Amino acid sequence: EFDEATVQDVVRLAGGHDSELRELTQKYDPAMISRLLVAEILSRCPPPSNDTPVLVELAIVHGSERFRHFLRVVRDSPIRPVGADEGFVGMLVEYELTELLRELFGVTHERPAGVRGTKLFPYLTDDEEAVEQIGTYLLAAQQGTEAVLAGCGSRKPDLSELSSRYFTPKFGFLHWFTPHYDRHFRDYRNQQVRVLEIGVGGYKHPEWGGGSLRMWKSFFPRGQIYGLDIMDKSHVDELRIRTIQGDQNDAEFLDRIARRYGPFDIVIDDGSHINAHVRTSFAALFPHVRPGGLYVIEDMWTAYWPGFGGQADPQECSGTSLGLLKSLIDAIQHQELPSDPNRSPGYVDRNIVGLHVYHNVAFVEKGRNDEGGIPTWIPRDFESLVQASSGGA
Amino acid sequence: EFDEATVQDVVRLAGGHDSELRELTQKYDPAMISRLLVAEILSRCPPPSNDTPVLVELAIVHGSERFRHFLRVVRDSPIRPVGADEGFVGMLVEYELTELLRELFGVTHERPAGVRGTKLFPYLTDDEEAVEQIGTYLLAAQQGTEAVLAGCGSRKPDLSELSSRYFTPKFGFLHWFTPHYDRHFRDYRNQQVRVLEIGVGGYKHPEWGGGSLRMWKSFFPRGQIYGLDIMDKSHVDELRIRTIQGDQNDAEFLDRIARRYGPFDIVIDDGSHINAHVRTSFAALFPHVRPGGLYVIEDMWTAYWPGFGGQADPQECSGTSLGLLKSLIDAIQHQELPSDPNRSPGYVDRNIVGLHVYHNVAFVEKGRNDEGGIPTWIPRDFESLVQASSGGA
Amino acid sequence: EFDEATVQDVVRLAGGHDSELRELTQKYDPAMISRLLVAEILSRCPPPSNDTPVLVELAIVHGSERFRHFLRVVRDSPIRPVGADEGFVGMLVEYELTELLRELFGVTHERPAGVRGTKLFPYLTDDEEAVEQIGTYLLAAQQGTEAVLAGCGSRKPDLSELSSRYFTPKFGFLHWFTPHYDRHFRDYRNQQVRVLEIGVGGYKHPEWGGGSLRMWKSFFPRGQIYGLDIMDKSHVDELRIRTIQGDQNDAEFLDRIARRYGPFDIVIDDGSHINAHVRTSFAALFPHVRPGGLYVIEDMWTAYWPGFGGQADPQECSGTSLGLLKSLIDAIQHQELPSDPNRSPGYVDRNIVGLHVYHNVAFVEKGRNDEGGIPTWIPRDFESLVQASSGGAT
Amino acid sequence: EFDEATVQDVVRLAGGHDSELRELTQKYDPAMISRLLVAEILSRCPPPSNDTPVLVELAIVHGSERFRHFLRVVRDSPIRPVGADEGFVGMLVEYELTELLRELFGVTHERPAGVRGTKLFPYLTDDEEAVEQIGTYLLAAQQGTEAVLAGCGSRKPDLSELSSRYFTPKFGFLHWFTPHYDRHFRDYRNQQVRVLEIGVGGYKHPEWGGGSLRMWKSFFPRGQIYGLDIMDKSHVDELRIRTIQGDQNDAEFLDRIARRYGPFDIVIDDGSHINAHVRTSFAALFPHVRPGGLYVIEDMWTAYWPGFGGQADPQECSGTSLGLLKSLIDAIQHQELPSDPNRSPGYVDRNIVGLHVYHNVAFVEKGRNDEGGIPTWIPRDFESLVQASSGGAT
Numbered sequence A, B: 001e002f003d004e005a006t007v008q009d010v011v012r013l014a015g016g017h018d019s020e021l022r023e024l025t026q027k028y029d030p031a032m033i034s035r036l037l038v039a040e041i042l043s044r045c046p047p048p049s050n051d052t053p054v055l056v057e058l059a060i061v062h063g064s065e066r067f068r069h070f071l072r073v074v075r076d077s078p079i080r081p082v083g084a085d086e087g088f089v090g091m092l093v094e095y096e097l098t099e100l101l102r103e104l105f106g107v108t109h110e111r112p113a114g115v116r117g118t119k120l121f122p123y124l125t126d127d128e129e130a131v132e133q134i135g136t137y138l139l140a141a142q143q144g145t146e147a148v149l150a151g152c153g154s155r156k157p158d159l160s161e162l163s164s165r166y167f168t169p170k171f172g173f174l175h176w177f178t179p180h181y182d183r184h185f186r187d188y189r190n191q192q193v194r195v196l197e198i199g200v201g202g203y204k205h206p207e208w209g210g211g212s213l214r215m216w217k218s219f220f221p222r223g224q225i226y227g228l229d230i231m232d233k234s235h236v237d238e239l240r241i242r243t244i245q246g247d248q249n250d251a252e253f254l255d256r257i258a259r260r261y262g263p264f265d266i267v268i269d270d271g272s273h274i275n276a277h278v279r280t281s282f283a284a285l286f287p288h289v290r291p292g293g294l295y296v297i298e299d300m301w302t303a304y305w306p307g308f309g310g311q312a313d314p315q316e317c318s319g320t321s322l323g324l325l326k327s328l329i330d331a332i333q334h335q336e337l338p339s340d341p342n343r344s345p346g347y348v349d350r351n352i353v354g355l356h357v358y359h360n361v362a363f364v365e366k367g368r369n370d371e372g373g374i375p376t377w378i379p380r381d382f383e384s385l386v387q388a389s390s391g392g393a
Numbered sequence C, D: 001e002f003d004e005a006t007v008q009d010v011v012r013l014a015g016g017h018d019s020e021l022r023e024l025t026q027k028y029d030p031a032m033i034s035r036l037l038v039a040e041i042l043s044r045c046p047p048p049s050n051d052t053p054v055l056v057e058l059a060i061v062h063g064s065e066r067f068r069h070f071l072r073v074v075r076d077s078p079i080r081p082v083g084a085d086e087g088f089v090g091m092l093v094e095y096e097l098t099e100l101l102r103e104l105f106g107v108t109h110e111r112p113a114g115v116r117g118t119k120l121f122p123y124l125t126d127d128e129e130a131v132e133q134i135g136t137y138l139l140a141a142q143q144g145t146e147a148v149l150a151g152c153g154s155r156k157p158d159l160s161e162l163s164s165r166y167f168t169p170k171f172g173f174l175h176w177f178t179p180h181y182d183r184h185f186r187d188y189r190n191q192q193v194r195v196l197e198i199g200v201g202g203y204k205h206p207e208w209g210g211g212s213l214r215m216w217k218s219f220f221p222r223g224q225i226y227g228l229d230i231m232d233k234s235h236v237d238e239l240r241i242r243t244i245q246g247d248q249n250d251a252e253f254l255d256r257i258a259r260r261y262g263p264f265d266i267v268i269d270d271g272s273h274i275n276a277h278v279r280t281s282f283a284a285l286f287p288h289v290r291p292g293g294l295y296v297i298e299d300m301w302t303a304y305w306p307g308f309g310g311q312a313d314p315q316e317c318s319g320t321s322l323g324l325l326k327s328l329i330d331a332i333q334h335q336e337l338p339s340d341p342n343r344s345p346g347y348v349d350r351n352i353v354g355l356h357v358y359h360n361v362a363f364v365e366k367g368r369n370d371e372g373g374i375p376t377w378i379p380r381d382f383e384s385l386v387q388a389s390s391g392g393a394t
């Protein structure tokens, strides 16, 4: 539907001040921008709760133009555009194009009022039949409007709820990841993030997968989401979600896609869960995580299982994902090693500043690890330290 | 020192992703950007607490270039650059140019580590008299470094403390404004705001004034501050602060400066406090407040005083700043008036969505006031409403 | 079963440290506390989304005791305690009693893990019949568990969504209040608030009303909610929600109930919308709002309508709700009035520190208004002020 | 003067609603409560910036009683109570006793106005002598008042700044810990925390140490701070800070003090940095951390140094603090281990739900680790998992 470079540019300019919003609406056809925003809104809207179907008219204004979209809203159906004559219009919602840009893709504070105009029952002519129409549609029009307006803003969603909405197992039964994802990701939400997740989902099934990609799209209103899978997943692609076919164990492939699409604020490994793959992808992609970014590994349970290249004995971890996580502790501490002119700190040593481990999910913080080791003039035995620190007492 | 349009462009690009940061460093000379960032850092640093004077070397790296700045840090003096030989270097602080841009002017999450490199006592050769140097400088180097690093980030300051630091009476004695300012302004801090304050301070004194402008500059890390005063205040101008000479009671002048420098996220009237002036400035400048922005009026105490054009009787308020505020309540409510084809809502009616009043300070929220009045089918008397709302009971 | 004084005492102690949690479970029978917590959980749970009915076992543990509750979870039905044999148990959720107290009623940080134990398919025999059962109940058990767990915590809800859920017109069609309520109320959520709303809803209908009271109960996990209505609303009452029958225009009655149930952190007038009533209730109840609390008035539109005692001319506001709000501006500013020996500041003058007005909703901040007026040595005319502030410069 | 049990009880009640505040001021002598609050305020005040010495009168009112405290405020000196005649009174600050309790020790929202009354130059006679006094004391009174008022609230401090102020090496030169401490601790600030830090500071010096204990007291307005040191540190003790003399390597002693003073929301090891000691203290004290609490270890650098019982080879970590941290990863993952009837999960296994490692500082999250391992019906090899997850597609 929309060119990815264009969408990213729209998001980039929408994040600016008045001059950037004006630049955007000058650079691109306002009609096209309007269609882009409607596409985003349709994916952003929560599930409708109204049993009686209603229409919500969304009118987008720019200059002398008015782009009218009639949205059919009913429980157990996705919100979709229809013809004006295809139901009862419960509400007219009016946005200025630049205001809707700010609300969806802007860097903005929460605005409790004044972002739009609203005209209830906009075509209900005041005659004898009106009272009947009011009784039938009053509740449904309130519920339908609430759903559409929720899709016109950037309010922070509940990851646990999105997980269930999108049929991904991140929370609720096998796993309990989303509170950790929320804590680690929420501070990135006003940024134009590039997120790469390895493992789109659905494996060989021709129709399944994409639930977690949808989740990140919903969570990051200004984000671009990339999903990597060995199987074709092009049926998942939509506005702000691109899938790529390839093997996470192919370092040459990883180089090309990282240099094409990166650098990434967030990389998540939810792929094969083969231990060697986890290690290969980390080695290849950690360099392409932005400073201040995150590398996440999901499902370390496979570290203990030979069928995934793991080992039943937790101490025999040299080739496992948990062996990697343990080594990252030494990487963090590398500046504390006794000096050796024959030893140079490696890339990971120099570039990890935090490790967070929870049950079956770990977060690695990318950044410059150059705080300085304990200086040579601090004693390297306890008694000497006490003496040095006691001021002659 | 620096071209205002360049500074604004630097801040605009610094708020972007990797591509915008690369664009910035390609567009402008990295040496010039380095000097710009140092200028910002020097204004951002808190007062040093160290009694013993130390140097903190700040090295800014970009490609093969390394821009070194030696900052003299001592209690009761502003941090300033000096020659490398002008004291003991307690700390070397290393930043990549693009990382420092992000930390000062970026749209960024809080980064608790990994933004810089640090090398303590960087030139202290390990001979016999190092012990002496360590004892003299250990505490001062810690304190000096803490001060410099505070100036290298975008942590939210305390407005009440800035008010004392910059000698403005917003808090502590006559007035208690800063907690309200903090509550209303804090959500704007990751935006590239344009703030206009009427009333620079110092009146006719050739050297005084500018304290509140410095406060806003400190509070809004990506902001451009404008100060309007009838007296010349050009001595106040610095990076991100421009003063303008003119009369707040001159509507033509206000049009020109608003269209030249606006639209404004925030406008504050702290000027003459003449009631007619407050009302004139509001009428002229409210249209130039951005939707989602704020118009602030300070010092409404003058509403009661003839010498400022006010009235001792609080009921005789048709020409006072408090009369204005009272009328804003009706403006907010204007859609609830009974219909009249001879009456059109005015500009303020259509554009106010909130009013906040505290002792001697009021905040007006700019936005589209078009929610819809109570529909005609809601009864206009109590009994009729009760009967209509009771379902036949 | 649950005495109001007991519930409030449970909430009070639950907000404490380890010594208070131990005190609570020693003071009261753990079995009763367990039932009370389950009652709360049932009201907190979001609507279930699973088509296939499942059971979630909630086991509350204290000492050598284990209180087992089997909760039936299915879309379009309220979550209800059933017998162990009345369905497939998709999940066992285990909470220590003191931990569940902290999670529902405590003053606590967000805890992303470690508050409970979970055992999926807890009674599913590992045999040839398992695979079909897994296929049938996997998604339903996940969705069922999520709904229950959401009810076992204190996460802030979306007020706008609750408006549609509880059928109150605070947001979505006629009004757009909830974002303002959220901004003004969210900072109170870890306090044991007492909230009084005038106007329960439903008017004379024998079944309708209570939606906004439910909303405040959900928003304030440690709160006690009171609803006043001229009509009987006893069918609305549930844990942490009490309704009172009476007239908001009776000042002596208002003082009686305020003494009995106050002081209130929050009072909301969403009642008759008769202008005289709004003014009577405010004068009577503002003194019973806590310092740091809020008095809220909803639906000021009636200020312009003679059918509610209003006036079409906005300047004729001496008897309207908007006239009251305008007067609150002068009350805030009262210390700035010129000196007068026979004029003394009134109660409202001395006790208002903020006013917030939005379309059809206003928030009044109760607190000590005693900052001091501009001192007499600050000049009372512009030209003299310039001179006094210029340090001799001419 | 102030009994520790009494201080903790005051904080406990101050955190309640109106009924608890009334109970507090009925249970204890209001004059004593006012002295207690003044002692707290004095420790909370930031360094004064005014060159000219001023007095700020703090008047605490309860019932018909008025407790007057005259505070001397000048740069480079701690704020201290003096006689009324010992300087110029720049400002009178008035608090009701229950309001000051809420502001210092309450569970409260931020209140931007209405908490107090202020009367500038309260005893300055309006005559020909006033103008000179105003000129001398205007700026000093403003800055003086600002310092005192900052001490009368519960605003979050900057931990990095406090590190410089209290002379502790947590941030600025050798270490860069405070941003991590802020991130992990800030959500606890509303709670009546019990914090134990091993290592008070100063080692054998008779006067040095205590900086980090002061830091935690400042950061946690409702907290009780405990500091363990092998050396006597009784000179550090003040309101809400207790030092304990003893050896962190004595597990039986550690259990004794943990029973006496716990359970702890937060334990920090910043002690000897001997590897055996770090491991002993963790095993002994982790059971005494509350669910939802934190165990913090500082200065793991010593893991690499034989002079602290460490090893230069990072792989030789079986006895080091880093070996402990690595093992906690397996503890977190313990439910994923293949079945073994003779193997039983240990205490740490069952009670760790998170691990955070930064340069020279690590945070361990205490909680119930009982989420359940991957079920037996999820295939234990990649190829079988592909097949089971592909719905028949080949």
Ligand SMILES: Nc1ncnc2c1ncn2[C@@H]1O[C@H](CSCC[C@H](N)C(=O)O)[C@@H](O)[C@H]1O
Pocket (backbone or CB within 6 Å): A167, A168, A169, A170, A197, A198, A199, A200, A201, A202, A203, A204, A209, A210, A211, A212, A213, A228, A229, A230, A231, A246, A247, A248, A249, A270, A271, A272, A277
């Ligand atoms: N070597 C490899 N490289 C890339 N993807 C692989 C792979 N081996 C398996 N996969 C894919 O990894 C996916 C794991 S399932 C991913 C689930 C998804 N993240 C969610 O939460 O909804 C499967 O779709 C599988 O096809």
Ligand SMILES: Nc1ncnc2c1ncn2[C@@H]1O[C@H](CSCC[C@H](N)C(=O)O)[C@@H](O)[C@H]1O
Pocket (backbone or CB within 6 Å): B167, B168, B169, B170, B197, B198, B199, B200, B201, B202, B203, B204, B209, B210, B211, B212, B213, B228, B229, B230, B231, B246, B247, B248, B249, B270, B271, B272, B277
């Ligand atoms: N008609 C007019 N137009 C613009 N500025 C005016 C004016 N009359 C007075 N002023 C200026 O308004 C200022 C008021 S004092 C401003 C103080 C400043 N906002 C602070 O907080 O520090 C004086 O500097 C005075 O010169």
Ligand SMILES: Nc1ncnc2c1ncn2[C@@H]1O[C@H](CSCC[C@H](N)C(=O)O)[C@@H](O)[C@H]1O
Pocket (backbone or CB within 6 Å): C167, C168, C169, C170, C197, C198, C199, C200, C201, C202, C203, C204, C209, C210, C211, C212, C213, C228, C229, C230, C231, C246, C247, C248, C249, C270, C271, C272, C277
């Ligand atoms: N004099 C009076 N005193 C108290 N309540 C009154 C009253 N006159 C009318 N009411 C009640 O005020 C209510 C107004 S409707 C309240 C709606 C509710 N707050 C909600 O948001 O869902 C009606 O139930 C009506 O019975």
Ligand SMILES: Nc1ncnc2c1ncn2[C@@H]1O[C@H](CSCC[C@H](N)C(=O)O)[C@@H](O)[C@H]1O
Pocket (backbone or CB within 6 Å): D167, D168, D169, D170, D197, D198, D199, D200, D201, D202, D203, D204, D209, D210, D211, D212, D228, D229, D230, D231, D246, D247, D248, D249, D270, D271, D272, D277
């Ligand atoms: N075995 C032991 N048990 C308890 N404390 C010990 C100990 N060995 C050394 N110590 C104490 O541990 C302290 C380490 S220095 C602590 C510094 C302090 N936390 C701060 O940040 O300012 C010294 O005071 C030393 O006396």
Ligand SMILES: [Mg+2]
Pocket (backbone or CB within 6 Å): A270, A298, A299
């Ligand atoms: Mg997964």
Ligand SMILES: [Mg+2]
Pocket (backbone or CB within 6 Å): B270, B298, B299
């Ligand atoms: Mg002013």
Ligand SMILES: [Mg+2]
Pocket (backbone or CB within 6 Å): C270, C298, C299
């Ligand atoms: Mg209402």
Ligand SMILES: [Mg+2]
Pocket (backbone or CB within 6 Å): D270, D298, D299
């Ligand atoms: Mg230490």
